[PDB]
RNA sequence: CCCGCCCCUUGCCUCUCGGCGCCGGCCCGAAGCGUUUACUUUGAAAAAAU
RNA sequence: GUGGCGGCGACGACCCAUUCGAACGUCUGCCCUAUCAACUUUCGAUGGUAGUCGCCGUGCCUACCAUGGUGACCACGGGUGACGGGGAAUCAGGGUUCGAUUCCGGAGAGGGAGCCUGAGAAACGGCUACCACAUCCAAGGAAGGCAGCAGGCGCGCAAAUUA
RNA sequence: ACCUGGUUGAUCCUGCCAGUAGCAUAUGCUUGUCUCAAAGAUUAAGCCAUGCAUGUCUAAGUACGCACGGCCGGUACAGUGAAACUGCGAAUGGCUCAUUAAAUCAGUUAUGGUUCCUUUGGUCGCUCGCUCCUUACUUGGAUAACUGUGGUAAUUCUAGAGCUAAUACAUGCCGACGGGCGCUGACCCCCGGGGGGAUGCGUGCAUUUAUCAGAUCAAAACCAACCCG
């Protein structure tokens, strides 16, 4: 749709879009050059990030963030905030006194870039650590894989 | 902070059963034959021998 | 006084926490620079580590860049027209980053006339290309250009920016018109 | 700490006009650090 | 604390200084310098505890203020100067030269070197970058910065530096088959040959080493210092050649010597 | 009943890179994917004092 | 000739790197209480955009937006003769009970707040005001902070040296 | 039948009792020789007389106190040096446990999201460019100590007046000469060598904003057969 939905002009900061040119180049196509980067560690840039038009300064591929630290996994539980979701990580904690285990879980709020679409509740997400993006958000979504049962 | 040492240990233990005729007779025989001063001198040597024999038993619990 | 710490805030779950220490020096905050338009008045602030910040209280000029023509000129500032954060800053004429201002067009017109040898703003190997958008021509007729401030006056002590052009200019013109 | 402690007591006119020099003394002036106070302390 | 600390408790000092417990409450806090606090040997410890030239700290001060001790060819009068790995200490009054090299016990050893060997040192390259006006710069492990290095020199390589001029004479590349010394961890002070290197992106690399007796061990990449090309070291080695010996094989060599005697 | 020597092992379109293919959709080659973990046994890295 | 050249040191200095740090973050781990079952969200609670302030990332704060965020896998509330750890004692083991106390980390300087200088302090053997104490005075004013080392007091009843 | 003894017609259950060793608190009687160590605690992080616990100068920032002093007419300053200015430290150490329950703390990881006195190593030169004619052989204004006049019951309180310093506080350029320093080279002269040269190209950063280039970019060598000249 339209990317200008805020009171300020939404723009990708490193791209200059007011270059004047001959009318021959103007007649052809008004396609802005996109900025994107390779985040490393074998993660591949999604196609829609390169071909898209969304503006997200917190996107790991088209924004100004750096991925460094821990790489984790989780299951998507809630998608109700703007560009950020809540995932859950389950584990077993061992008690030595009784020589047994107990089930525990942790909840994480992670930033979801608009490049990832058709993400549902219950699929596996691989996230990486970045700088604090808000009060509680410190991880940013790197890869999405669908639930095994649901096709 | 000081430049002193706090490392110390006791060298004997008082007997577990205080009224045993056999224990008293053994102490009397040892003190009389070796001219010792009191019971503490016997208990010190008993403590040393107990440590040595406990170490030997613990070593014997292992493979050759 | 002013503190920008985290431990006065509630937890993520919603529960509140009790402090275990008093306020620290490295958590301080300082009153804002409500930079107005007028004769130049700038104060210096000694900051952590022994460095300096230029706290501009009042400014009237800045150098702005005509990006399409690559012409950077120092020009006076006339008025504040639009502010995305709050409309009160427009009413009180406060200079902050990313606010839209009106600047004089005289040095840009002078450079254009001395460069291309064509008239502009007047009432009724490759050659140089002299083409101007109709919106920019109308603004040059009015004598005032719409510009955007890119620096932080309360931190660096100067108000720099660039002349609005293209789709950004159309967006901000539509916003200004809809505000009225 | 709901329990009662021992030390309970220990833990519970226009101003004069000023025309000073150019250098500012107002660097640290606040509510607890007033530039000028009345010469006569309240009894 | 409200600022930097200036004291060091004696029991909290590094264990390889071999300080006793009853001498005093404090230990010499090293000055800031080329080497880190936990991986250095202060001049006072080397001068009164290892060599016994002085009895107290005042005598160390009296020796140093006569400008007798030179570290890497320069006179130092600070008695808490942090001297570290591959440093050269010269005392012309006694005609002695020393090089600080770890022994197999993880401690700096009193290693005397020939005066011709005292003219150079080995340094591990820590950083390569382009400075102002496109001039390449190289930063070593002892905070030496050198301009115009050879383009073939990369990070984790070893260079030989002439102490008088502070210029690179030649270098050893980091490769499998070269000789290396371990400068940290559990295998500190052990000398061997690099066999292979394991790479972990975004993490620490792991390197495998094998010594002359065939024993194998592994360390992190930051704990390895290349010493020689091939099997030949470029510096003299201490009494032990980097082989850490066990009690069983010490008994074996004692039995062999006893059998060969008679 | 040992020991050589050669050959088939199907597939799929979630991601990525492609198409000189058809009406945004579809087809195709792939350069794409085609199990993961717990457990157990190792190896690194992990202040002294006690 | 108001010639031309110079040796060895000291101090100072913009920036880069180094050292000693400091400060914000990541992951996992705490005692009793459910006769505390729902909590947060007006006065920021969760997230988005632009900004202010800050050494910097960030609801840290301010405007405009969405309606979120946590919870029987025990949130939230309450209590603690609760500074945390390395450690001490006792055990066949598992555990249990202690840990103000000479090492490491945190916090405070009678109580709540504020501030100057400085690379570094919200400093108290620094400063300013309030509360509680308290010394000298010619009654106007002035000067204070032993949970540093000694030493005194804490109804009359009592335990280290003003070296 | 999981220590030894007790509570029954017989067998049991539940409440119990005594003996055996330590830890802590308080308190007695005795105490010849010697070595080592310790010393908290009224939920009172309650209150404190007196004294002490943080200062510092090298040949190398500033001496016109005869305060003391050698040599003297060469006489700006021999030398020592109280005071005061300047610089640095006083944010370490020592004490205490009141607050504090994802807080502190412990292990692990990050700085590509910041600051950093010191130490150590780098870096720290000028062509011309209307400032013309004959401060860069060194530019400017002050203030303590000191002299003197004072106020108060009283403090490490200070007021007025008069001198004088800087590595304190400021300002500020490169004096004259030489093809300024480097490359690049048509032609030319001598003896593979020396020269002279038509010419061409260069010759500070730091800050703030905008734009451009950045691995579809630059720089180089190697090259059988087969052509091309
Ligand atoms: Mg301290
Ligand atoms: Mg020191
Ligand atoms: Mg922001
Ligand atoms: Mg926001
Ligand atoms: Mg408490
Ligand atoms: Mg403790
Ligand atoms: Mg404090
Ligand atoms: Mg008190
Ligand atoms: Mg300072
Ligand atoms: Mg305070
Ligand atoms: Mg005090
Ligand atoms: Mg103090
Ligand atoms: Mg005392
Ligand atoms: Mg008493
Ligand atoms: Mg009974
Ligand atoms: Mg000096
Ligand atoms: Mg002073
Ligand atoms: Mg210093
Ligand atoms: Mg200081
Ligand atoms: Mg230096
Ligand atoms: Mg100065
Ligand atoms: Mg210059």
């Amino acid at each position: 749709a339209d990317i200008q939905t805020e009171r300020a002009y939404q723009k990708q900061p490193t791209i200059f879009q007011n270059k004047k040119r001959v009318l021959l180049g103007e007649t052809g196509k008004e396609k802005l050059p996109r900025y994107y980067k390779n985040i490393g560690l074998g993660f591949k840039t999604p196609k829609e990030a390169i071909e898209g038009t969304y503006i997200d300064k917190k996107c790991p591929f088209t924004g100004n963030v750096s991925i460094r630290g821990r790489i984790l996994s989780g299951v998507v539980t809630k998608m109700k905030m703007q560009r950020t979701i809540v995932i859950r990580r389950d584990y077993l904690h061992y008690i030595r006194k009784y020589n047994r285990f107990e089930k525990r879980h942790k909840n994480m709020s992670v930033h979801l870039s608009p490049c990832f679409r058709d993400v549902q509740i219950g699929d596996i997400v691989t996230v990486g650590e970045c700088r604090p993006l808000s009060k509680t958000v410190r991880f940013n979504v790197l890869k999405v894989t669908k639930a095994a049962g649901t096709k | 902070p000081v430049a002193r040492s706090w490392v110390c240990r006791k060298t004997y233990v008082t007997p577990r059963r205080p009224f045993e005729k056999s224990r008293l007779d053994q102490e009397l025989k040892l003190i009389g034959e070796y001219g010792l001063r009191n019971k503490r001198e016997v208990w010190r040597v008993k403590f040393t021998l107990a440590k040595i024999r406990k170490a030997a038993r613990e070593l014997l619990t292992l493979d050759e | 006084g002013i503190s920008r710490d985290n431990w006065h805030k509630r937890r993520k779950t919603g529960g509140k926490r009790k402090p275990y220490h008093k306020k620290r020096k490295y958590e301080l905050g300082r009153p804002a620079a409500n930079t107005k338009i007028g004769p130049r008045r700038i104060h210096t602030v000694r900051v952590r580590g022994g460095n300096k910040k230029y706290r501009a209280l009042r400014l009237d000029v800045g150098n702005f860049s005509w990006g399409s023509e690559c012409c950077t000129r120092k020009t006076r500032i006339i008025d504040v027209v639009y502010n995305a954060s709050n409309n009160e800053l427009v009413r009180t004429k406060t200079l902050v980053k990313n606010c839209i201002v009106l600047i004089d067009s005289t040095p840009y017109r002078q450079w254009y006339e001395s460069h291309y040898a064509l008239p502009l703003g007047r009432k009724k190997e490759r050659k140089k290309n002299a083409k101007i958008s109709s919106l920019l021509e109308e603004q040059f007729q009015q004598g005032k250009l719409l510009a955007c401030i890119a620096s932080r006056p309360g931190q660096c002590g100067r108000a720099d920016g660039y002349v609005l052009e293209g789709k950004e200019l159309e967006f901000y013109l539509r916003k200004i018109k809809a505000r009225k | 700490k709901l329990r009662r402690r021992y030390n309970i007591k220990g833990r519970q006119p226009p101003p004069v006009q000023l025309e000073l020099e150019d250098k500012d003394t107002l660097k640290g002036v606040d509510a607890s650090n007033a530039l000028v106070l009345p010469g006569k302390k309240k009894k | 604390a409200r600022g930097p600390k200036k004291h060091l408790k004696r029991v909290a000092a590094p264990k390889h200084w071999m300080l006793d417990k009853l001498t005093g409450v404090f230990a010499p806090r090293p000055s800031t310098g080329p080497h880190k606090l936990r991986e250095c040997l202060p001049l006072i410890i080397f001068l009164r505890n290892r060599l016994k030239y002085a009895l107290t700290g005042d005598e160390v001060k009296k020796i140093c203020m006569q400008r007798f001790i030179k570290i890497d060819g320069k006179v130092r009068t600070d008695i808490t100067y942090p001297a570290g790995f591959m440093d050269v200490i010269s005392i012309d009054k006694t005609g002695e030269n020393f090089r600080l090299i770890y022994d197999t016990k993880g401690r700096f050893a009193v290693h005397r070197i020939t005066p011709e060997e005292a003219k150079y040192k080995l340094c591990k390259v820590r950083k390569i970058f382009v400075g102002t006006k496109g001039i390449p710069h190289l930063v070593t492990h002892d905070a030496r910065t050198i301009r115009y290095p050879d383009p073939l020199i990369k990070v984790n390589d070893t260079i030989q530096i002439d102490l008088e001029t502070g210029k690179i004479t030649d270098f050893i590349k980091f490769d499998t088959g070269n000789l290396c010394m371990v400068t940290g961890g559990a295998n500190l002070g052990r000398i061997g040959v690099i066999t292979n290197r394991e790479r972990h992106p975004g993490s620490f690399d792991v390197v495998h080493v094998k010594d002359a007796n065939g024993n194998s061990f592994a360390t992190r990449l930051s704990n390895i210092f290349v010493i020689g090309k091939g099997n030949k070291p470029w510096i003299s080695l201490p009494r032990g050649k980097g082989i850490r010996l066990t009690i069983a094989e010490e008994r074996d060599k004692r039995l062999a010597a006893k059998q060969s005697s008679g």
Side-chain angles (χ1 to χ4, degrees):
Chain A
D2 191 23
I3 55 176
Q4 307 298 327
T5 47
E6 313 281 352
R7 296 184 55 177
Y9 186 73
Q10 294 300 104
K11 183 184 57 179
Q12 201 165 5
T14 187
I15 293 295
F16 178 54
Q17 61 192 359
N18 288 327
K19 181 176 173 66
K20 70 172 184 175
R21 51 190 175 183
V22 299
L23 304 188
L24 295 180
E26 181 184 354
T27 312
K29 181 53 188 177
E30 294 83 1
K31 187 62 179 183
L32 294 174
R34 195 99 163 120
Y35 167 75
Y36 62 95
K37 64 182 174 187
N38 167 42
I39 71 173
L41 298 174
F43 291 92
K44 40 195 178 181
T45 305
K47 179 57 147 302
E48 191 277 332
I50 304 178
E51 298 322 295
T53 178
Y54 64 92
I55 295 300
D56 189 14
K57 65 177 184 178
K58 300 174 182 177
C59 173
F61 307 97
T62 66
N64 196 41
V65 296
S66 179
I67 298 300
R68 75 287 181 280
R70 304 181 182 266
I71 311 295
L72 302 183
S73 278
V75 295
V76 176
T77 48
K78 277 189 301 183
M79 324 172 96
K80 285 183 172 304
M81 293 173 282
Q82 299 185 3
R83 282 170 166 172
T84 187
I85 63 181
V86 172
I87 70 168
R88 169 160 173 156
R89 305 179 67 242
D90 294 278
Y91 59 101
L92 289 175
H93 180 250
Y94 172 75
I95 311 292
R96 195 180 38 181
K97 176 177 184 174
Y98 305 98
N99 204 27
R100 278 169 170 82
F101 297 86
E102 70 188 338
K103 288 166 72 174
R104 289 192 179 185
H105 83 281
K106 290 285 178 59
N107 275 13
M108 293 177 70
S109 292
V110 297
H111 185 87
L112 182 67
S113 180
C115 65
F116 298 110
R117 318 178 289 171
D118 295 329
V119 182
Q120 309 300 300
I121 288 179
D123 49 3
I124 305 297
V125 61
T126 299
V127 298
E129 183 182 357
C130 57
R131 62 174 172 88
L133 305 178
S134 69
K135 185 187 177 190
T136 67
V137 171
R138 281 91 169 93
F139 281 79
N140 189 358
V141 165
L142 300 186
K143 188 178 72 173
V144 182
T145 178
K146 306 294 296 182
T150 67
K151 71 185 186 296
Chain B
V2 291
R4 305 193 173 101
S5 183
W6 311 316
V7 178
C8 59
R9 67 178 182 89
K10 289 193 58 184
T11 58
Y12 74 102
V13 185
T14 61
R16 38 199 285 268
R17 281 75 178 272
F19 314 82
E20 292 215 341
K21 288 300 311 170
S22 50
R23 195 199 100 249
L24 294 167
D25 297 8
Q26 190 217 26
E27 272 159 17
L28 167 67
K29 204 191 185 186
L30 289 171
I31 292 183
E33 293 179 353
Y34 292 91
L36 307 181
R37 182 178 61 189
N38 48 13
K39 302 296 183 70
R40 195 194 163 143
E41 299 193 353
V42 176
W43 299 340
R44 172 171 55 186
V45 186
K46 182 191 173 184
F47 185 83
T48 301
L49 177 60
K51 272 177 165 173
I52 293 179
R53 279 173 63 173
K54 170 174 207 164
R57 194 268 175 294
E58 294 294 328
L59 285 169
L60 277 171
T61 59
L62 304 168
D63 182 51
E64 294 181 1
Chain C
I2 305 175
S3 182
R4 50 196 320 275
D5 66 83
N6 189 359
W7 42 263
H8 80 281
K9 205 88 177 187
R10 280 188 173 270
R11 290 193 171 95
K12 178 187 176 179
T13 67
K16 55 184 302 297
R17 57 167 71 93
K18 298 191 300 181
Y20 74 96
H21 69 83
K22 310 174 177 184
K23 292 186 178 184
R24 289 295 145 96
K25 161 77 174 188
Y26 60 87
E27 303 165 341
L28 68 89
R30 297 193 186 98
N34 303 285
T35 305
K36 295 303 185 303
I37 301 182
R40 187 168 64 187
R41 184 177 179 179
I42 299 175
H43 293 178
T44 51
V45 178
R46 194 264 192 192
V47 304
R48 182 174 186 89
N51 312 98
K52 289 189 305 178
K53 272 180 186 176
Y54 305 94
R55 187 69 59 84
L57 296 182
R58 196 174 65 197
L59 284 175
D60 67 60
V61 288
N63 64 321
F64 292 85
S65 183
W66 194 356
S68 56
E69 305 292 338
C70 295
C71 173
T72 310
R73 283 298 182 276
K74 179 184 175 181
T75 312
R76 66 180 294 165
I77 300 180
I78 303 180
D79 202 357
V80 181
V81 287
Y82 188 74
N83 188 278
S85 301
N86 189 11
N87 189 359
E88 272 305 296
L89 304 177
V90 169
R91 184 182 64 82
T92 60
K93 273 75 185 176
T94 300
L95 290 179
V96 292
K97 180 178 167 56
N98 210 31
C99 78
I100 310 298
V101 292
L102 274 169
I103 64 178
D104 198 319
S105 66
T106 304
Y108 302 105
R109 179 187 57 79
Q110 292 177 358
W111 173 85
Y112 186 92
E113 271 146 359
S114 179
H115 190 270
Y116 295 107
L118 274 80
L120 175 147
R122 296 291 185 269
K123 281 192 180 180
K124 199 175 180 180
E125 296 95 10
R126 296 296 93 195
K127 275 74 69 177
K128 307 172 180 302
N129 175 33
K131 297 296 289 183
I132 301 299
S133 296
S134 66
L135 310 170
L136 282 178
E137 280 161 56
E138 293 179 353
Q139 298 209 65
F140 270 116
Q141 295 298 109
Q142 295 298 109
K144 298 180 297 298
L145 296 178
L146 283 172
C148 180
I149 295 182
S151 65
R152 307 150 70 183
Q155 306 284 321
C156 66
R158 60 184 85 179
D160 305 358
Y162 56 91
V163 182
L164 288 181
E165 311 162 16
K167 293 178 178 180
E168 206 176 323
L169 175 57
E170 293 171 52
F171 172 84
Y172 279 118
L173 277 172
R174 183 169 65 256
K175 287 298 175 176
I176 292 175
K177 180 181 55 183
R179 186 185 56 101
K180 304 170 183 173
Chain D
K1 304 295 179 181
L2 62 84
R3 63 159 306 110
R4 186 176 182 272
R5 294 183 178 182
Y6 172 75
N7 189 13
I8 287 286
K9 291 174 71 175
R11 295 165 159 281
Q12 44 80 24
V16 186
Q17 289 319 301
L18 282 182
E19 65 183 1
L20 270 298
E21 59 266 14
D22 202 337
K23 63 189 178 70
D24 51 350
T25 301
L26 275 295
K27 204 267 180 182
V29 174
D30 208 341
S32 294
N33 302 267
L35 187 49
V36 63
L37 281 184
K40 180 70 176 67
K41 287 185 180 179
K42 281 334 289 183
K43 182 63 70 177
Chain E
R2 285 175 285 157
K5 310 180 79 70
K6 303 180 181 174
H7 293 71
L8 180 70
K9 289 300 168 61
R10 179 166 273 252
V11 68
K15 201 199 170 174
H16 67 271
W17 296 357
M18 311 172 58
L19 294 180
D20 62 353
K21 67 184 289 184
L22 291 187
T23 290
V25 176
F26 294 99
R29 188 181 182 91
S31 303
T32 52
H35 302 275
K36 279 185 171 301
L37 191 146
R38 308 290 298 184
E39 293 83 3
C40 72
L41 183 64
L43 194 57
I44 178 170
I45 304 298
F46 180 75
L47 202 59
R48 78 168 178 194
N49 288 127
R50 295 299 104 86
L51 297 180
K52 311 295 192 307
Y53 283 138
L55 301 191
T56 60
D58 205 359
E59 283 179 350
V60 177
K61 185 69 177 176
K62 285 179 178 180
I63 291 178
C64 286
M65 284 286 315
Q66 290 182 102
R67 319 190 94 250
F68 283 161
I69 317 296
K70 294 162 55 185
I71 298 186
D72 291 341
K74 311 192 68 176
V75 174
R76 304 299 181 186
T77 57
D78 185 15
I79 69 170
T80 53
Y81 189 88
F85 185 63
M86 204 78 60
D87 272 6
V88 181
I89 302 175
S90 299
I91 311 176
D92 299 350
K93 206 70 177 183
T94 60
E96 293 179 353
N97 296 271
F98 306 90
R99 172 161 278 154
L100 290 187
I101 297 295
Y102 293 108
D103 59 6
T104 186
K105 297 285 185 178
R107 301 187 216 132
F108 283 117
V110 175
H111 182 52
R112 296 178 165 85
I113 62 180
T114 313
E116 292 83 3
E117 193 191 326
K119 295 192 170 62
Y120 64 93
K121 68 175 291 173
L122 294 181
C123 299
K124 178 182 174 183
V125 178
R126 289 272 186 83
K127 189 178 301 185
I128 295 286
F129 65 97
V130 173
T132 315
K133 302 307 175 64
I135 299 177
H137 290 78
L138 173 146
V139 175
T140 76
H141 82 282
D142 48 356
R144 290 175 180 267
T145 179
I146 302 181
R147 303 202 311 171
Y148 300 115
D150 196 299
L152 296 181
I153 303 177
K154 303 296 179 179
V155 177
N156 299 126
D157 294 350
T158 295
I159 56 179
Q160 177 172 133
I161 278 157
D162 185 66
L163 291 182
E164 293 83 3
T165 59
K167 296 185 179 305
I168 307 178
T169 52
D170 62 358
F171 63 98
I172 311 172
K173 200 74 179 179
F174 182 87
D175 193 8
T176 63
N178 287 323
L179 200 72
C180 72
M181 191 165 205
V182 188
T183 55
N187 304 282
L188 164 60
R190 289 185 69 196
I191 299 176
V193 164
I194 300 177
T195 300
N196 79 300
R197 163 180 170 176
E198 293 179 353
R199 323 179 82 101
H200 301 103
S203 181
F204 313 98
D205 288 5
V206 180
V207 187
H208 293 70
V209 191
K210 189 166 64 176
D211 58 340
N213 297 30
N215 293 336
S216 296
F217 53 95
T219 59
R220 283 182 176 176
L221 181 52
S222 58
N223 290 332
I224 280 176
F225 198 112
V226 178
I227 296 302
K229 177 172 180 52
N231 296 114
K232 304 289 103 174
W234 284 21
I235 57 168
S236 79
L237 295 186
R239 183 178 182 270
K241 300 300 183 182
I243 297 89
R244 177 183 293 170
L245 270 180
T246 80
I247 46 181
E249 60 189 359
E250 282 190 24
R251 294 195 300 271
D252 294 350
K253 70 182 307 183
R254 179 195 64 191
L255 288 179
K258 273 193 172 185
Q259 288 287 348
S260 299
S261 302

